[PDB]
């Protein structure tokens, strides 16, 4: 037939598109999270040196 | 997770459904074979009626 | 027919789950990156305050 092929292929394409988009988003989320952790760690030391400077 | 058991459930659903699909496939297929044999004996009946009718008409 | 509809329904369940996961991951990325950039701005303000204290 004809309809089954096109519908099935389009739906599998939709699933694959959503999956890859989710993977890209999660990768960027993990990278941003680690960079945020770095920012926290540096900010604490910045606060410590600021406190010493103020003393 | 809930997604895992849901996936297994829709999975066994697909399995039983395709099973019954192939099953009624086979059943209707046997029925079609029987109907084909019916058509064949039907054409046999057509031919025999034709020849006997023609004999009657000849006489 | 019969099995074809069920197979389509399976292909649609995969569609919904993949699309929902993709959208949720995208929202997670947006939230995480906003968190990181706000932390970076806080770090910048701390640097400027340290500069004023140094002056």
Residues 6 or more apart from C40 whose CB is under 8 A from it? A39
CA dihedral A36, A38, A44, A50 (to 10 degrees): -100
Q: What is the maximal distance between C-alpha atoms in chain C?
A: 82
Cα radius of gyration rounded to whole Å, chain C: 24
Q: In Å, what resolution does this model reach?
A: 5.0
CB-CB under 8 Å, C1 with B17 = no
Which of B21, B23, B26 would you mutate first to test chain C, the one with the most C CBs within 10 A? B21
The closest CB to that of A14, out of C15, C29, C36, belongs to C15
């Amino acid at each position: 037939m004809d309809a089954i092929k096109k519908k099935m292929q389009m739906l599998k394409l939709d699933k694959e598109n959503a999956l890859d988009r989710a993977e890209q988003a999660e990768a960027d989320k993990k990278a941003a999270e680690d960079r945020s952790k770095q920012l926290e760690d540096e900010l604490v030391s910045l606060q410590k040196k600021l406190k010493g400077t103020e003393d | 997770d809930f997604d895992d058991i849901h996936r297994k459930r829709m999975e066994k659903d697909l399995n039983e459904l395709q099973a019954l699909i192939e099953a009624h496939f086979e059943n209707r297929k046997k029925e079609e074979e029987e109907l084909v044999s019916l058509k064949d004996r039907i054409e046999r009946r057509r031919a025999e009626r034709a020849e006997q009718q023609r004999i009657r008409n000849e006489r």
